[PDB]
Write a protein that binds this DNA or RNA. Structure first.
Lengths: 279, 96, 94, 94, 94, 272, 256, 262
DNA sequence: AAAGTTGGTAGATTGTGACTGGCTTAAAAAATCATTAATTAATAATAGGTTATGTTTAGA
DNA sequence: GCTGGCGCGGGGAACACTCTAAACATAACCTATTATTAATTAATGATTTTTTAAGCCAGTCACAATCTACCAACTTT
DNA sequence: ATTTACTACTCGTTCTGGTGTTTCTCGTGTGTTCCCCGCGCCAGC
DNA sequence: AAACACCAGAACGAGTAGTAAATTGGGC
């Protein structure tokens, strides 16, 4: 009377769900959310690519077990939906792909090959040769900031510079909230894809030192194709509920662009750059 | 007694070769000498001695149990002529 | 076929083994076999033959070139016996 | 032609026969079919028109995020709840 | 990605929680979802695995004549019955 | 509350009902068996329902059948159409006056007949010829089609027979053919009446009350209908009727004839 | 002609249509002598009985109580092509259409129509004269009249039920004659155009006046009592049986 | 270091991880003094608690009783990139791989490995010593032994017991690896599977205490062997502090590669 | 805004140095050989007491 | 305008194999049987074969250094 | 003759609140090739 | 402390007896 609990492919899942103010428990083998008033909320954890946990939640041990067994990443988030903590099963990773990523990460020449492939995949143009990796970071950063200014003038939102920390937000910022929440949604489904294929989310190429370098890179590939413009639409319209509209809009973007189904071939194409046939 | 394993063991010890290669070398080492001698060729190993082929004429023999005379048919036998290097090392040996 | 001529034919058949490897091996194999009989221990290779040591009774020998006597002390001599397969394959006559 | 699901509870028998006109009565009070969207809204008009103090939920196939949509009539211990644009179902206490 | 509907009855709580892992539990014993054919057959393997003396029916959307397909597990007073190639349901007497 | 029927293309093709009494329970079309197993039938998702021997239908069941626009057809042995009933007022008078107006002119009738011939065999009919010799040409071409397709499937064929009495208990070929053509007559009249046209106004055949159904079915019978019945006659099962009905219904499923029948009828009537 | 069968099951055992009551009261029926069989509510016909009825060409018509409504009928859209093409030939020719419409006025008010009056002009005559008849009879039977208005008010509902009953029996009569309900003359385009016209022929004879009387009595459930009363008139007066020669002369106005 | 928390709710009240017990007993845990928290079954962690755990970088790993299992871990797939690249570099270089595998042999049986020997050859030697240990332990505890042949379908009593013992072993081994921060899939003697490093470090201390207890409980022959085996393994892991001491073991194992871990 | 000037860092291409690789030679050691008078392996068929070595088999 | 109809491509189940030590299978050596046959040893100086020390000149393989040069960055007009 | 509304009235079923009861559903040499499902381009009312 | 097995017990609503009633669900 024990059938093995297998996870389903990630491309055939719901993007994300946000949970707040209620205790997380399991009843009879189901991921159910119970509120303090007693209303129980059945949550199809096996149908979700990633579940986002906002403040007010109390997660049980068995709930973490069940979430891990279905390959659904739980993400503890906080103010303005920023990612703070996450946990899912690490062992959804057959070693050939990890050794391929690490092999490409150790070799400086293959490192430049893959970074070049990233620059070619973002801006649609061949990467500039005779440039070090640091120079590619500088040029890429200047081009990205130019993209922020360009979209900011296009849609029309008052741009004062990108500011990660919500501390500096002047109660009507709405632009950094849309950007940061959108990037948190994309980092969510992207991290879910990375662990779903099994690569190392900490072993990165462009970013160094920070524990989410590879996630930041893979999301930086395709955030400005679909996500950032819609975030700027939500920032321009300026509603009283920015977070809900950011979640709905980013969610429909992920449904429309088929982002999760193409994240895995995207990473395969990124890591193919090392001239070695991917595993 | 010295065996193929101990010879392979010595190849493993001295040359650090694989036990698979050390086996096959010793295996084929005598195989070629088998092939060479069966090819009618004299094998003369400096520092070791000579492998000679000698043909013996048919000569009277018998069943040693009884004495019943049965002749020794003509044959090609392999003989060894130890070299002076070998002879010198053996004259002062100590049989265990 | 002498020592070196034996070496190449082996390397010929053992393409995957370096020629330098074969050269030292034949040198080391026979030197190891010599040291074994040098210490009084025998060698027996089933299918090929065996190496034994024989004692010879000391007696007053002769210098056969001159006829002069010579006092010969006892010693040990190597002796080979052909193996079954060696006997069979070598003798082409009945 | 998308798939359609109708769950009936505490409803007068007229509604269950009327729904049995188009959909299949596979279990107690659970109806399933596959019809066009106009006909789905007409059958939803049947649900709003013929039911009593009972409660009915109708779920149909779409091409949205979940691939399906549903709508409720009446009151149940299970009440649909929206989570950031996603319509889920929550179980009320006694 | 086709529609998926699971109706449970007389089933142990393990099967209901397991079905709630992927599917949405909108009514008492009524589960609705939209997944692929594989994953559908995997969840059907769960249904065959955990239902003890219960009766469960799973109905999924296709492009057949009805636009959907279903199969049953266990025994019910309502059982599927074939009408010249068409799978319908018959209401058994007491 | 009112009871609106559904579009004809979003419907199951046909259902054959046998050995049970048809009653209404709480507004539902139910088949009641003698053993007590009652059968809920999604009657509003069906285009046409076939009534086999053994059925006993009550008045209110016929009323509900008419109010949902699903045509009920009493069928007997060999699946041949016996009787049928539908709602009278499901027709637009302009369409009927158009059909009959086209029936009034002989030359426009010849135009539409040539339209049916060019849609049937691809080639236009020989010009300036009367109807009867076109009927003879039709018979020769259809007989040649019998011999050709029967020679393709390798099925015992010695001619066409209509009465099941002359059958030697192992004929089965006219059984499959007649069952297929009768099912096609069923869905054909179902579509013709669903749009609201007059199936009594005939073009090739005259005198019979469904000559228009006969012509419209003769247009598209030889595209899919005959060969599968020839397959069921070739494989020769114990109960061929069920396999012919299942096979023909799934043919109507795959080829999606119902949705294209209305523009087909409009295209035929264009020649008038 | 026709037969009314109520609260009994129709089977065939010995070549006759038997009506089977719950107590066993059998009605042995010779198959001919009637062109149409009216199946009133409460009847359940078996498959074989439908087969035999099909074998003799006798039209089966699922009706309301005593034929008050027409729910379903066999041979839909007609059975013989010659009669339908005759009606259509009279319908499409504006000269013949006007001839038959003038016959409808001739039998409608008993008075002949003035010469050289079209279908539009005779429609104006019928509209003004018949509206004057509405206000006239409403004034005679003491009915508050606000202009014949209905919204899909007791009197308009009673008149509505009367029109429903008459449309039922008249439509059954037309199907018994075998003609199309939609091929009409005074009304056209509608699926009950011929039904609405021949229904307009005898509408103000007894049915609408009885609706006025029962409406003046004003009961709690007017539609049921008016429907049962019209049922009683249809039974006693044999209206459905008498409508046949009327349509025979109406379509005879085309001079065969 | 490490800490086990059981049968109580994890909240934050006074800026410290408090354990909310059924009686109200609160267990004050300072934000420091712990590098990783292993959460045993029966705990319900609060959102503010998880936020505090992230804020001081303390890894949370949801485990079983005393680390009998590892169900989920934060920082999934690793947390420090330098350590993962350190291990992966040790795994890619054949010379360093042979060095570290030889260290695993050195700590596995106490004896130094034979020199000029490859990795697969050391797999053979280690396997022969494993069979010798199977027969020898079967001789010690007097248990009928027929070899380790099981089915992956039916779940014999001795292979059941040893299977459960190795499961607990994988539990504390993976918990120790994640506490150190290394990748379970980057392995040395075992490769390919996502628990290769877990399989190897598990095999390092497999036959010291745990499998002997499997043979002992197989000798006592209970009706439900698995539960008694893993409860006894819990007793071993708690009393012997195996999970607490595996971390410096892996520190030395990877230290033998000599690239100075980060 | 558009050209013109830097320029540093990939990639290529050359320079260099250290180490394999045969070829030929030198000699250097090692094997033949000429010639004793006699000893001593070499044999056959047979039984039985070592063992060298192929073959399997549980272990990773 | 997003759908139905044929297409490969990717990620998993057989299977396809490696390495150890030890235990076992067994056919192959060992001895010890006879007397007659066949062939080696004692030795050295002179001669003869084989191997090898030392080039040592050629090449060639990998790595230091030096050079093209791009495509953006930044001054000049 | 059937069908529908209403009213007891049984009773299978689902939910809730009690008790135990248990803290799990487990095995690991590696790489190397067939098997079918899955995104992805052409014909369409 | 959470969560599962298992139990009685309460709703509780589906299904099925009876009974009573209607023959219907527009207007053109």
């Amino acid at each position: 009377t024990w059938l093995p609990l297998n996870p389903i492919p990630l491309k055939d899942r719901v993007s994300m769900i946000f949970l707040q103010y209620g205790q997380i428990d399991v009843i009879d083998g189901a991921f159910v959310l119970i509120d303090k008033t007693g209303i129980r909320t059945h949550i199809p954890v096996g149908s979700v690519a990633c579940i986002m946990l906002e403040p007010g939640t109390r997660v049980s041990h068995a709930a973490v077990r069940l979430a891990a067994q279905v390959g659904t990443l739980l993400v503890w988030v906080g103010e303005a939906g920023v990612r703070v903590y996450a946990s899912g099963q690490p062992g959804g990773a057959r070693s050939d792909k990890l050794l391929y990523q690490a092999k490409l990460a150790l070799d400086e020449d293959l490192r430049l090959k893959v970074v070049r492939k990233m620059f070619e995949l973002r801006f649609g143009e061949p990467a500039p040769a005779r440039r070090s990796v640091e120079q590619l970071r500088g040029i890429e950063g200047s081009r990205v900031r130019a993209t922020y200014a360009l979209l900011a003038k296009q849609y029309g939102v008052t741009w004062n510079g990108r500011r990660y920390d919500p501390k500096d937000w002047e109660k009507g910022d709405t632009i950094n909230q849309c950007i940061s929440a959108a990037t948190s949604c994309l980092y969510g489904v992207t991290e879910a894809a990375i662990l779903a294929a099994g690569y190392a989310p900490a072993i990165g190429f462009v970013h160094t030192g920070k524990p989410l370098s590879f996630v930041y890179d893979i999301a930086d590939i395709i955030k400005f194709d679909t996500v950032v413009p819609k975030a700027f639409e939500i920032a321009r319209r300026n509603p009283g509920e920015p977070d809900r509209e950011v979640r709905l809009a980013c969610r429909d973007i992920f449904r429309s662009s088929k982002t999760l189904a193409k994240l895995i071939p995207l990473i395969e194409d990124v890591l193919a750059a090392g001239e070695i046939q991917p595993p | 007694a010295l065996t193929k394993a101990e010879m392979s063991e010595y190849l493993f010890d001295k040359l650090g070769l694989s036990k698979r290669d050390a086996k096959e070398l010793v295996e084929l080492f005598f195989e070629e000498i088998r092939r060479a001698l069966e090819n009618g060729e004299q094998v003369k190993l400096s520092g070791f001695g000579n492998f000679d082929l000698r043909d013996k004429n048919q000569r009277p023999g018998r069943n040693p149990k009884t004495g019943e005379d049965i002749p020794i048919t003509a044959r090609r036998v392999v003989t060894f002529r130890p070299g002076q290097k070998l002879k010198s090392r053996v004259e002062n040996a100590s049989p265990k | 076929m002498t020592k070196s001529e034996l070496i190449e034919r082996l390397a010929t058949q053992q393409s995957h083994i370096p020629a330098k490897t074969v050269e030292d091996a034949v040198k080391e194999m026979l030197e190891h076999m010599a040291s074994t009989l040098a210490q009084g221990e025998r060698i027996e290779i089933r299918g090929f033959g065996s190496f034994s040591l024989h004692y010879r009774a000391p007696r007053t020998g002769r210098n056969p070139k001159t006829g002069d006597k010579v006092e010969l002390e006892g010693k040990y001599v190597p002796h080979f016996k052909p193996g079954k397969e060696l006997r069979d394959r070598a003798n082409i006559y009945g | 032609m998308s798939m359609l699901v109708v769950v009936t509870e505490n409803v007068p028998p007229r509604l269950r026969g009327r729904l049995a006109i188009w959909l299949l009565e596979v279990r107690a009070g659970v109806y399933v079919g596959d019809v066009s969207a106009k006909i789905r809204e007409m059958i939803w008009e049947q649900i709003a028109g013929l039911a009593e103090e009972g409660n009915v939920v109708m779920a149909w196939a779409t091409n949205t995020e979940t691939g399906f949509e549903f709508q409720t009539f009446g009151l149940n211990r299970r009440t649909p709840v929206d989570l950031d644009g996603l319509r889920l179902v929550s179980f009320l206490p006694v």
